[PDB]
Enzyme design. Structure first.
Site, PDB file in Angstrom:
ATOM      1  N   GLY A  29       0.825  -1.192   0.000  1.00 36.82           N
ATOM      2  CA  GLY A  29       0.000   0.000   0.000  1.00 36.82           C
ATOM      3  C   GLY A  29       0.862   1.246   0.000  1.00 36.82           C
ATOM      4  O   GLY A  29       2.046   1.216   0.321  1.00 36.82           O
TER       5      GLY A  29
ATOM      6  N   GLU B  50       0.065  -4.232 -11.320  1.00 36.66           N
ATOM      7  CA  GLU B  50       0.932  -4.963 -10.402  1.00 36.66           C
ATOM      8  C   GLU B  50       0.243  -6.215  -9.873  1.00 36.66           C
ATOM      9  O   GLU B  50       0.873  -7.272  -9.745  1.00 36.66           O
ATOM     10  CB  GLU B  50       1.361  -4.056  -9.249  1.00 36.66           C
ATOM     11  CG  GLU B  50       2.427  -3.036  -9.620  1.00 36.66           C
ATOM     12  CD  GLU B  50       3.825  -3.624  -9.637  1.00 36.66           C
ATOM     13  OE1 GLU B  50       3.972  -4.832  -9.356  1.00 36.66           O
ATOM     14  OE2 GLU B  50       4.781  -2.877  -9.931  1.00 36.66           O
TER      15      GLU B  50
ATOM     16  N   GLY C 213       7.442   0.605  -1.251  1.00 34.92           N
ATOM     17  CA  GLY C 213       7.354   0.801  -2.688  1.00 34.92           C
ATOM     18  C   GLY C 213       6.349  -0.148  -3.315  1.00 34.92           C
ATOM     19  O   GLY C 213       6.002  -1.185  -2.746  1.00 34.92           O
ATOM     20  N   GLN C 214       5.875   0.219  -4.507  1.00 31.46           N
ATOM     21  CA  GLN C 214       4.909  -0.576  -5.255  1.00 31.46           C
ATOM     22  C   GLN C 214       5.423  -0.905  -6.654  1.00 31.46           C
ATOM     23  O   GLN C 214       4.678  -0.815  -7.633  1.00 31.46           O
ATOM     24  CB  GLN C 214       3.563   0.143  -5.336  1.00 31.46           C
ATOM     25  CG  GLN C 214       2.950   0.479  -3.986  1.00 31.46           C
ATOM     26  CD  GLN C 214       2.806  -0.736  -3.091  1.00 31.46           C
ATOM     27  OE1 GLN C 214       2.295  -1.774  -3.511  1.00 31.46           O
ATOM     28  NE2 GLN C 214       3.255  -0.612  -1.847  1.00 31.46           N
ATOM     29  N   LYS C 215       6.693  -1.285  -6.761  1.00 29.06           N
ATOM     30  CA  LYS C 215       7.301  -1.612  -8.042  1.00 29.06           C
ATOM     31  C   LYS C 215       8.272  -2.768  -7.852  1.00 29.06           C
ATOM     32  O   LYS C 215       8.999  -2.827  -6.856  1.00 29.06           O
ATOM     33  CB  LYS C 215       8.025  -0.399  -8.646  1.00 29.06           C
ATOM     34  CG  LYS C 215       8.721  -0.676  -9.970  1.00 29.06           C
ATOM     35  CD  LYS C 215       7.731  -1.133 -11.031  1.00 29.06           C
ATOM     36  CE  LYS C 215       8.446  -1.612 -12.283  1.00 29.06           C
ATOM     37  NZ  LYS C 215       9.345  -2.765 -12.003  1.00 29.06           N
TER      38      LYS C 215
END
Ligand SMILES: Nc1nc2c(ncn2[C@@H]2O[C@H](COP(=O)(O)OP(=O)(O)OP(=O)(O)O)[C@@H](O)[C@H]2O)c(=O)[nH]1
Ligand SMILES: [Mg+2]
Lengths: 431, 184, 87, 1043
Positions: free
Chosen positions: B23, B105, B69-71
């Site tokens: 998140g 993602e 992070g979201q990567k």
């Protein structure tokens, strides 16, 4: 004493090895208790090759049972001849593989390889003069496809001066309905091309077509094919367990039959083809048995050698026959001036005569040849390999574990190069 | 046998799990942690980097893996020693610009397989503010009808009359415990 | 040559108005030769000719004949079998 | 509109099929094949949920309710009972016997039926052992019920149960385990432990005292006794086994279990003594010490199961021990890391340390030695035989680090992580085994995640993950450089890599290490040049070959990297390397030749290393212009090029290419007086020595010298180009002396191609460049090699020359397009296109694919457009620019329908048909079938047209006439005629009597099978004469006469 260690992998491998041991034990004259009861001196002159001497005149079988599933282990141990096997050679797991080469080669297959080596290392230490090894498995599942090749490479490294022979089993859609099977089969071939000295391809489709046409069976089960497989395996390993005029072992056979290291796929055969029934038609003669064992109908693979070129041929006879008759037949048939001349039989054939006949049959012939017809099977497999790699179906199942996409392309390139080399070597003359 | 069998036996005995929580709203995660520990500030606020914490709730050793992070989150998804059992994603309801990246993602992370897999828990914080989407809009945007082999569930929350969150957390534990562990 | 002949009959499931004639073809006869014979025999293109055989020992089972490069002896075709022509 | 649950799907999907299979069991046992089919299908479905058997938990009640209902039938025969027992055993094996059997009926009245079926079991029956295996397991389930056995009362039920257990504990099948489970769940009962427990103990003691290890029965008896004793001690109280915990140990000490050969018995004894020691301590007393001693001794066992059992026992015993005893045990375990110990003892000590750290029973003062033993275990590799041992020690150390990270707090484990972090990443990116690297990667990830505050923790974690570590080559070149980019990870890498990899017993590992050194050398110039280079120069003079093989690689690679750094600032290489390095690099070949180390099988590695060293030093522009070292290098290169047949074929091409590259680099670097000139004396001597060796009887010498001459630079071929061209043309030609020298001619061609590509095209310079004064002499020489068809015992070797000739023609054509395209003639280009089409119409898959790629390359070249191309528009329409990669030329099905369409062009109707004739009458079944199916697709449009069919018949007839008395073309053509005449392709010619075409065809045949002895030729002739009877008139009579 040129001892040979036998290894069994996968359910099919374990079953085939058990049936082969059951067949050879009744031929060598060994009771389920472990002692000897034969009435001939030729049954013990080479018993130290596949067995070991113990206290009280015991002959322990030299085989190792390995699996990631215990069901097969329990089935054999409690078999008719399972009490003679060494309990220390039973190494199995629990989970298994689930028809996945990655789960059997990099994940669960690598957590048992070290334990397997323990048994091998320890079994090879008691041998006075080790010759090589052996492995019976199949190219369909995930255990015998990944863990098998892993152990093969282990033996190749730890022991690079020995011999390695496998008895792989080619899967067929007429029997198994698995989908990823072809991929696993290729991944195994990509390693078998480089880390194998001799290979005996046993096509399941050919056996199914034979049982559904010649033997006329409504539903050919697994035993109907396993019987023929064990019979062929007992027919091939006759020169390694009984002496004769053609004095040779595994190294000499691999040198004489395999001229090129990349080309080593053979096509076995056996005649006459009988089912599991304890019946018999009539005692066939020498020319009839020769024509039956040299015909494309009695071939264990779905490949016609008439469309290829024979490299090295070797036949092994079993029965109450003399070498003079076999020589006269091989000299008369290869004469074009005679009326019984045939073209579908090669000329360069190494003959051999054995005294002890097979169990249940008075006369039987075994065919071993290195025809360049395995390219048909390699193209049939490449067809399924390319008809599923274009859509990238079920490819994430291998990449989610640690495999790389380049391995599949490398295996495809190796298979294409092998097919091209076979097609190039098929055309060869000598004037 | 081997190390994997011993690890599986230890996981079945100690009832150890691993919940990968993701998140970027940096506001909806506090209450989630508060549900795992009676504390309110210590080991409750999310970190910018990557922290590994261990809490006890309902007799389950939850190993929360908070990633900021979201990567390229595939590095935390799999591990040579332990896998991921649960996945909790927290997004913003009044934000339609940063939803496509989260959907991509989630589509690249979760993939189809033979048997069952990890369980998904989609969280929708801040629903009373103007511009928030309903459950149907969130399901249609993220396209959760094409995601198989992973049971998902949308749980809403708000600063006022947010309908609590006890069932959304209880269903995840009921689906995880009844998958790997045995009832009796 | 006479001992190698196979006394088999011919049937047509699609065209039942024709009679079930019986031919004597050699055992080493290939499938392509029989296909060419039927093509001229029925003035039907050989490209869309389907071949099959049914033995009285195995009723209810139909084994097709697809490969033209093989022979009748390889397909375990014995004397007393029947040939089905489908087009 | 808040709580929304996603749709759910049932895990098990065979409930129905399985229900029908279980219900139809009453009509399957009658047949034999049906039973086998049902057994196979039933098993396959169960194996589907093997990985996760927990999903079948709700589907384990209705199956049992249908199976035990059939088993409990008083009218069902024994066959159906055995069939149901087999299904029950398969279900137990798939799921488990510790949960599924909890459903089996356990009521007082049921126990009697359960044992009754047991007394009727025949042990001498290998076809029904599953019944005997499941019966004891079901009888054990019943024993749990709390009810006096007496209530139901040799004669008594308890005595019969004990006798059955004693008789089944000595069998050889799988029932033994069931007998042990029964004797463990029945003896430990409140009303049974008063008159049978000790009775059984005496029997077990007698069995352990009388059985031996030589007989086969004794081993199984001891196995059963050990299993029973272990299960009883596990599922028993502490107050009951107490008065009998020393006699068992005293009896087991006299059996000498560690001094045997059985592994299962050793592991069972280890487990038994572990459980005895655990029972001794309260949940110090006499006996505890010896137990612990046996546990330790077993920690150093050869096998791994005994080591794991001993480690688990030590970890479970360290919890129930006082502080002093636990500290002493920890010290004794840590003291096992000695130099005189083997890898098994190290693995056992590591497993014991892991078991200690898992429970948190390790003092912080012992952590100082824990760090030391971890650093010692992370670098453990001993040479033994061909390979090396110790790959499990690294995995054990990684597991210990992972357990210690997940055990201790981030504050209590702060100085530990900062000392084992550098060791972890190094092994992860440079270890040979993938598992070792992946194991280290997981430990480093866990440490970074649990510590919180960590430098570049995510930087490396994201860069190197569980999958990335998968590719080994990259771990030493890509990720290694990115990790070395940080100042705290540059020097330890280069030092460790040079001290442990450059000399690894594997040549591939040494090459990877040499490449990693060069890649990392830039990230640290000063250090690598001043400290590493002296070590490499000192190790190049070592008695070890691999150390000598590897070091020389590093000296060559680093020097190149240092030269590249100084060239960006425009400085010579003498700035970084001092005079000491220059003097050291000048005496390598001399010292290697003075010792004669190039002989034997170990000299090939030195010859390959010196060649790479010279190749690297030549590009570095070293100041050795005019020294004896250049003459020595030239002599060694000449000796290597001359001696090639002695080297094995596995490493011959690599050595040849390396020698050619080194020669080309040396001749371009150290052989140049003025810019654009060369020394006439050295050039003339080299030309004389290179042109005289082209007549050597050895094929390997010619093959090497061709590639050696095909690598000279442009300035060295000034004024002497015609001589080299004539020398290369005289070799590509064949003679009775050299008929099988296919390789040599191919090498000669290539060399010509490389010379034409390097020199260039200048106007009016026949002896200096390649122009119109000497382009025809090369074109004819390249076209004459296309007709190579040499067949020997190895196979068809003409493809090796054809591919080389096609590649040379491809490299030449475009060259003229860029330089003087006018030189391109029309007839020559047309012949080249026809030959390319013919080689593309072949049968070999790889050869056809390469020919098709060459054809598509010259066709899509439009910068500038190649002139004199017949049917350019039709070829562009049939082969668009978008259909290049979408056409798989390796498969005949995706190649033949596109090649057959070339028959429509009047220009290529000859060569394409001549090529397809060989493919139609070849030998592969699949290729023949594909060609036959593709020929009709084109023939069905020219059948009705008489002119189009007559043109094709005349073309094929002419082909037949041009290829007479040649079994390579005649027999395939006859096979093609036989395959076409049976398809009725030529019928529009059967209406007239004596049609022209047949009169000629029949005549050609009567000349091919005249006075012949080939069987295939006679068969083809008979087939043609039998199929050619469709033409009435005199042709039919002549065919009848010929038959
Ligand atoms: N001829 C023959 N083939 C068999 C036999 N048993 C299995 N097969 C074939 O083997 C393939 C499946 O491989 P398995 O033997 O199930 O492999 P495994 O490695 O034990 O299986 P997993 O661990 O589940 O991947 C299919 O092609 C089966 O038809 C047998 O007794 N005889
Ligand atoms: Mg299996």
């Amino acid at each position: 004493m040129r001892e040979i260690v036998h290894i069994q992998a996968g359910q099919c491998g374990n079953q085939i090895g058990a049936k082969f041991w059951e067949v050879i034990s009744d031929e060598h004259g060994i009771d389920p208790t472990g002692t000897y009861h034969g009435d001939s001196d030729l049954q013990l002159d080479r018993i130290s090759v596949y067995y070991n001497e113990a206290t009280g005149g015991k002959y322990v079988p030299r085989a190792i049972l390995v699996d990631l599933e215990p069901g097969t282990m329990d089935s054999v141990r409690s078999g008719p001849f399972g009490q003679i096997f060494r309990p220390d050679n039973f190494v199995f797991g629990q989970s298994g593989a689930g028809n996945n080469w990655a789960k059997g080669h990099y994940t669960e297959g690598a957590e048992l390889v070290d334990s397997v080596l323990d048994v091998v290392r320890k079994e090879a230490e008691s041998c006075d003069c080790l010759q090589g090894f052996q492995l019976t498995h199949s190219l369909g599942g995930g255990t015998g496809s990944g863990m098998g090749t892993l152990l093969i490479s282990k033996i190749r490294e730890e022991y690079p001066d020995r011999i390695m022979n496998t008895f792989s089993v080619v899967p067929s859609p007429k029997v198994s309905d698995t989908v990823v099977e072809p991929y696993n089969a290729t991944l195994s071939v990509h390693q078998l091309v480089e880390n194998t000295d001799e290979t005996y391809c046993i096509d399941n489709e050919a056996l199914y077509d034979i049982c559904f046409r010649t033997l006329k069976l409504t539903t050919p089960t697994y035993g109907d094919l396993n019987h023929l497989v064990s019979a062929t395996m007992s027919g091939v390993t006759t020169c390694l367990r009984f002496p004769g005029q053609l004095n040779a072992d595994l190294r000499k056979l691999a040198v004489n039959m395999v001229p090129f290291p990349r080309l080593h796929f053979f096509m076995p055969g056996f005649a006459p083809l009988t089912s599991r029934g304890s019946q018999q038609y009539r005692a066939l003669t020498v020319p009839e048995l020769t024509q039956q064992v040299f015909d494309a109908k009695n071939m264990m693979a779905a490949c016609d050698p008439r469309h290829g070129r024979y490299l090295t041929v070797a036949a092994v006879f079993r029965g109450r026959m003399s070498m003079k008759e076999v020589d006269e037949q091989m000299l008369n048939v290869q004469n074009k001036n005679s009326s019984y001349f045939v073209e579908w039989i090669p000329n360069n054939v190494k003959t051999a005569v054995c005294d002890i006949p097979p169990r249940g049959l008075k006369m039987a012939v075994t065919f071993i040849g290195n025809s360049t017809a395995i390219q048909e099977l390699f193209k049939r497999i490449s067809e399924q390999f390319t008809a599923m790699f274009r859509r990238k179906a079920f490819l994430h199942w291998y990449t989610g574990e640690g495999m790389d996409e380049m391995e599949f392309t490398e295996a495809e390139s190796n298979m294409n190069d092998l097919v091209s080399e076979y097609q190039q070597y098929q055309d060869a003359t000598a004037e | 046998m081997g190390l994997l069998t011993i690890l599986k036996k230890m996981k079945q005995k100690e009832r150890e799990l691993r919940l990968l929580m993701l998140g970027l709203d940096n506001a909806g995660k506090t209450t989630i942690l508060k549900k795992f520990n009676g504390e309110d500030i210590d080991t409750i606020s999310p970190t910018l980097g990557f922290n590994i914490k261990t809490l006890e709730h309902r007799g389950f050793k939850l190993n929360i893996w908070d990633v900021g992070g979201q990567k390229s989150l595939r590095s935390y998804w799999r591990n040579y020693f332990e896998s991921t059992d649960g996945l909790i994603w927290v997004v913003d309801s009044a934000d339609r610009q940063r939803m496509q990246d989260c959907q991509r993602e989630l589509q690249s992370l979760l993939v189809e397989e033979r048997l069952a897999g990890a369980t998904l828990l989609i969280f929708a914080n801040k629903q009373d503010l103007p511009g928030a989407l309903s459950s149907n809009a969130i399901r249609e945007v993220l396209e959760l009808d094409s995601i198989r082999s992973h049971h998902w569930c949308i749980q809403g929350c708000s600063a006022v009359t947010g309908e609590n969150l006890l069932p959304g957390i209880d269903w995840l534990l009921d689906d995880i415990s009844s998958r790997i562990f045995t009832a009796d | 040559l006479k001992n190698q002949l196979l006394t088999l009959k011919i049937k047509y499931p699609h065209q039942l108005d024709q009679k079930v004639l019986e031919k004597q073809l050699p055992g080493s006869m290939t499938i392509q030769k029989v296909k060419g014979l039927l093509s001229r025999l029925l003035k039907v293109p050989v490209s869309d000719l389907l071949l099959s055989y049914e033995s009285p020992k195995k009723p209810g089972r139909e084994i097709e004949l697809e490969n033209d490069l093989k022979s009748l002896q390889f397909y375990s075709v014995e004397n007393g079998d029947c040939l089905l022509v489908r087009w | 509109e808040t709580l929304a649950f996603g749709a759910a799907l049932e895990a098990f999907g065979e409930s129905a099929e399985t229900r029908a299979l279980l219900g139809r069991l009453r009509e399957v046992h009658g047949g034999g094949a049906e039973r086998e089919v049902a057994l196979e299908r039933f098993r396959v479905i169960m194996d589907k949920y093997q990985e996760q058997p927990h999903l079948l938990d709700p589907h384990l009640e209705w199956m049992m309710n249908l199976l035990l209902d059939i088993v409990q039938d008083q009218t069902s025969p024994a066959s159906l009972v055995h069939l149901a027992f087999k299904f029950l055993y398969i279900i137990t094996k798939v799921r488990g016997y510790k949960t599924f059997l909890r459903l089996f009926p356990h009521e007082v009245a049921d126990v009697e039926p359960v044992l009754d079926l047991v007394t009727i079991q025949n042990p001498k029956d290998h076809e029904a052992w599953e019944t005997r295996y499941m019966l004891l397991l079901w009888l054990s389930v019943t024993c749990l019920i709390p009810f006096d056995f007496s209530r139901l009362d040799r004669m008594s039920i308890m005595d019969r149960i004990l006798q059955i257990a004693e008789s089944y504990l000595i069998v050889s099948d799988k029932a033994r385990d069931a007998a042990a489970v029964l004797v463990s769940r029945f003896i430990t009962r409140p009303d049974v432990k008063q008159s049978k427990m000790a009775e059984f103990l005496d029997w077990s003691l007698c069995n352990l005292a009388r059985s031996s290890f030589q007989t086969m029965q004794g081993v199984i008896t001891m196995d059963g006794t050990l299993q029973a004793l272990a299960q009883i001690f596990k599922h028993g109280k502490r107050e009951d086994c107490l008065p009998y915990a020393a006699t068992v140990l005293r009896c087991l000490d006299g059996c000498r279990l560690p001094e045997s050969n059985q592994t299962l018995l050793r592991k069972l004894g280890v487990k038994l003594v572990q459980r005895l020691g655990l029972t001794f301590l309260k949940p110090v007393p006499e006996g505890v010490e010896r137990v612990i001693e046996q546990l330790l001794v077993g920690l150093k066992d050869k096998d791994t199961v005994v080591r794991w059992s001993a480690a688990k026992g030590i970890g479970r015993m360290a919890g129930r021990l006082p502080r002093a005893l636990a500290d002493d045990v920890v010290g004794s375990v840590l003291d096992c890391f000695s130099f005189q110990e083997t890898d098994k003892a190290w693995h056992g000590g590591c497993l014991a340390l892991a078991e200690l750290g898992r429970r948190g029973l390790l003092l912080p003062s012992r952590l100082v030695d824990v760090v030391a033993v971890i650093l010692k275990a992370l670098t453990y590799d001993e040479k033994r035989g061909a390979c090396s041992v110790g790959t499990n020690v690294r995995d054990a150390a990684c597991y210990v680090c992972w357990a210690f990270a997940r055990a201790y707090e981030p504050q209590e484990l702060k100085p530990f992580v900062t000392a084992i972090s550098s060791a972890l990443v190094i092994a992860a990116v440079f270890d040979r085994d993938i598992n070792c690297r992946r194991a280290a990667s997981a430990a480093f990830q866990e440490n970074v995640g649990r510590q919180g505050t960590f430098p570049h923790g995510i930087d490396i974690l994201t860069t190197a993950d569980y999958f990335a570590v998968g590719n080994r080559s990259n771990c030493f070149l890509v990720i290694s450089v990115f990790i070395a980019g940080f100042p705290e990870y540059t020097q330890p890498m280069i030092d460790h890599l040079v001290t442990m990899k450059i000399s690894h017993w594997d040549g591939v590992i040494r090459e990877l290490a040499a490449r990693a050194l060069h890649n990392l050398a830039q990230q640290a110039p000063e250090f690598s040049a001043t400290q590493v280079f002296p070590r490499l120069l000192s190790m190049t003079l070592s008695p070890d070959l691999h150390m000598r093989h590897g070091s020389i690689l590093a000296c060559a690679e680093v020097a190149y990297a240092l030269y590249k750094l100084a060239a960006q600032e425009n400085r010579p290489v003498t700035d970084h390397l001092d005079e000491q390095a220059v003097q050291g690099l000048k005496q390598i070949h001399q010292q290697l030749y003075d010792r004669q180390l190039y002989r034997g099988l170990g000299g090939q590695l030195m010859r390959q290393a010196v060649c790479v060293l010279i190749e690297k030093l030549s590009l570095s522009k070293m100041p050795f212009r005019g020294d004896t070292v250049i003459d020595g290098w030239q002599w060694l290169i000449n000796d290597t090029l001359r001696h090639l047949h002695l080297i094995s074929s596995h490493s011959r091409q690599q050595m040849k290419d390396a020698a050619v590259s080194a020669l080309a680099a040396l001749c371009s670097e150290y052989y140049m007086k003025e810019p654009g000139e060369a020394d006439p004396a050295i050039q003339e001597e080299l030309i004389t020595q290179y042109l005289a060796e082209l007549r050597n009887p050895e094929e390997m010498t010619r093959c090497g010298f061709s590639l050696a001459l095909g690598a000279l630079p442009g300035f060295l071929l000034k004024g002497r180009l015609q001589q080299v061209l004539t020398g290369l043309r005289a070799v590509t030609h064949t003679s009775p002396e050299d008929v099988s020298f296919a390789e040599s001619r191919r090498d000669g061609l290539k060399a010509i191609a490389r010379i034409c590509q390097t020199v260039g095209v200048k106007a009016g310079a026949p002896d200096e460049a390649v122009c119109g004064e000497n382009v025809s002499q090369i074109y004819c020489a390249l076209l004459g090699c296309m007709d190579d068809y040499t067949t020997d015992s190895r196979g068809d070797v003409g493809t090796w020359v054809r591919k080389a000739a096609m590649t040379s023609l491809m490299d030449l054509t475009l060259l003229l397009a860029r330089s003087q395209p006018e030189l391109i003639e029309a007839h020559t280009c047309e012949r080249i296109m026809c030959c390319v089409a013919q080689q593309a119409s072949e049968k070999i898959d790889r050869f056809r694919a390469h020919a098709a790629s060459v054809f598509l390359t010259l066709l899509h070249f439009d910068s500038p457009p190649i002139p004199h191309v017949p049917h350019r528009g039709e070829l562009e329409k049939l082969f668009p620019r978008s259909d290049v990669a979408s056409v798989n030329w390796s498969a005949p099905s995706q190649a033949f329908p596109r090649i057959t369409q070339l028959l429509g062009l009047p220009t290529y109707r000859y060569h394409v048909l001549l090529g397809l004739v060989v493919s139609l009458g070849g030998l592969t079944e699949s290729t023949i079938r594909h060609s036959t199916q593709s020929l009709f697709e084109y023939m069905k449009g020219i059948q009705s047209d008489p002119q189009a069919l007559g043109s094709f018949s005349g073309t094929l007839l002419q082909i037949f006439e041009d290829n007479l008395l040649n079994e390579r073309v005649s027999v395939p053509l006859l096979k093609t005629l036989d395959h076409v005449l049976t398809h009725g392709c030529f019928d529009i010619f059967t209406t007239e009597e004596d049609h022209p075409f047949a009169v000629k065809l029949l005549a050609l045949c009567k000349k091919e099978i005249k006075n012949s002895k080939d069987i295939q030729k006679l068969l083809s002739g008979i087939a043609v004469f039998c199929e050619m009877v469709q033409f009435p008139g005199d042709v039919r009579r002549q065919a009848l006469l010929q038959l």
